């Protein structure tokens, strides 16, 4: 059974780089390799096969080469919609096994998040809980801080745009009506290092 | 102008058997090898075997064989991928994917299908509730449905630019819960009509619902 190694593991380039991917097979393989890429939610789409065999459609940046035990994937210049997991497999004997992958990041300059925020429905009310969500939106790097202040939260952040290289997180805040109807300001604070101090965006209930 | 649908998403409780279906068009289907291609949850490609549906001839990796079945009705241009009792540890992502022949050929996955979520567990399916998230920023909440995955489109597929599904969180209750958010100019907040199609398959529940302002 042929094991499969890559490296870098993950690695991060600003725009218009060059980016060099290495896969090292257990044995001699010849020419007996391919590689995908995998967008975040999406399926894989061959980028080359035959180590070094450009597959119809995929951009001319993408170059591959190597045989025997070590086989490189590069990326001319790279683009923002480039920032995706790349996974090289073995076509010489069954099982045709991949290689573990490599997340590709992209850098950008430093953006701040456009912070807004939704008041529970009174729909959602009716029905026994109360959401409160706080949304940071288009915002780099991925690290940011929240907290729910009123005077058992959660958080999600999506994958990196493939157009503008930012990410956006939500936090929702849940409460049972019962409590939800025991305060009057509620408020989420954001810190980031793109913004020159915490911002806050609020709501007093009833419109 | 090759393209492989694969079965929605299911939900079964382990010691159940499962069959998954992909329909194949655009090509000769009974001339090039199929495969498919298993991902867990967080984790990389698994190869877990190849049929050659003009013959049936499979070739399976030696971690999948005896596991599972690989067959093909080459009357309907369909590959099928059989569990007899699913494990836990059956949970994943599914792929299908044409196993193409390039001049001992060189052998590639050229095409893929979108992939069927299976998730094995003991617990009962939920639909999701929707509510608005009303206003320039919009969305919907998507709470309290199990199991993964739910989609989240908006206006029938005609809004897509600055359109944000985030992925789905586990509360303590045990329900996942995710928000579909899209930016829009706050001028056609009084102009324009949105709408996020939210589809669960797991529960055949699909919701349509209309976002206003408060």
């Known amino acids: 059974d042929i094991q499969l190694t890559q490296s870098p593991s993950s690695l991060s380039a600003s725009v218009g780089d060059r980016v060099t991917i290495t896969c090292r097979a257990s044995q001699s393989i010849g020419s007996y390799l391919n590689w995908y890429q995998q967008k975040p939610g999406k399926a894989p789409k061959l980028l080359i096969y035959?180590?070094?065999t450009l597959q119809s459609g995929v951009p001319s940046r993408f170059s591959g080469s190597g045989s025997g035990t070590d086989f490189t994937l590069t990326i001319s210049s790279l683009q923002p919609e480039d920032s995706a997991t790349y996974y090289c497999?073995?076509?010489?004997?069954?099982?045709?096994?991949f290689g573990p992958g490599t997340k590709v990041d992209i850098r950008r300059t430093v953006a701040a998040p456009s912070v807004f925020i939704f008041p529970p429905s009174d729909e959602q009310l009716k029905s026994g809980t109360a959401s409160v969500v706080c949304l940071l939106n288009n915002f780099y790097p991925r690290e940011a801080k929240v907290q729910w202040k009123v005077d058992n939260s959660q958080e999600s952040v999506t994958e990196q745009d493939s157009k503008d290289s930012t990410y956006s997180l939500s936090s929702t805040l849940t409460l049972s009506k019962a409590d939800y109807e025991k305060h009057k300001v509620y408020a989420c604070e954001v810190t980031h290092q793109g913004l020159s101090s915490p911002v806050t965006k609020s709501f007093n209930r009833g419109e | 102008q090759v393209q492989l649908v694969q079965s929605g998403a299911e939900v079964k409780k382990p010691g159940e058997s499962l069959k998954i279906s992909c329909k194949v068009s655009?090509?000769?289907?009974?001339?090039?090898?199929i495969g498919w291609v298993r991902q867990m949850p967080g984790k990389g490609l698994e190869w877990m075997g190849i049929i050659y549906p003009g013959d049936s001839d499979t070739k399976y990796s030696p971690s999948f064989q005896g596991q599972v079945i690989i067959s093909a009705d080459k009357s309907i241009n369909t590959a099928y991928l059989q569990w007899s009792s699913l494990k836990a540890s059956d949970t994943a992502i599914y792929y299908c994917a044409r196993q193409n022949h390039y001049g001992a050929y060189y052998y590639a996955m050229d095409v893929w299908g979108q992939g069927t979520t299976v998730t094995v567990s003991s617990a009962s399916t939920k639909g999701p509730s929707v509510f608005p998230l009303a206003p320039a920023a919009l969305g919907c909440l998507v709470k309290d449905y199990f199991p993964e995955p739910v989609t989240v489109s908006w206006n029938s597929g005609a809004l897509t630019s600055g359109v944000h599904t985030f992925p789905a969180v586990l509360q303590s209750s045990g329900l996942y819960s995710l928000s579909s958010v899209v930016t829009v100019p706050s001028s056609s907040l009084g102009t324009q009509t949105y709408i996020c199609n939210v589809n669960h398959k797991p529960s055949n529940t699909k919701v349509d619902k209309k976002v206003e302002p408060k």
């Open positions: 035959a180590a070094s």
């Open positions: 497999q073995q076509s010489y004997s069954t099982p045709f096994t």
């Open positions: 655009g090509y000769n289907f009974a001339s090039e090898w």
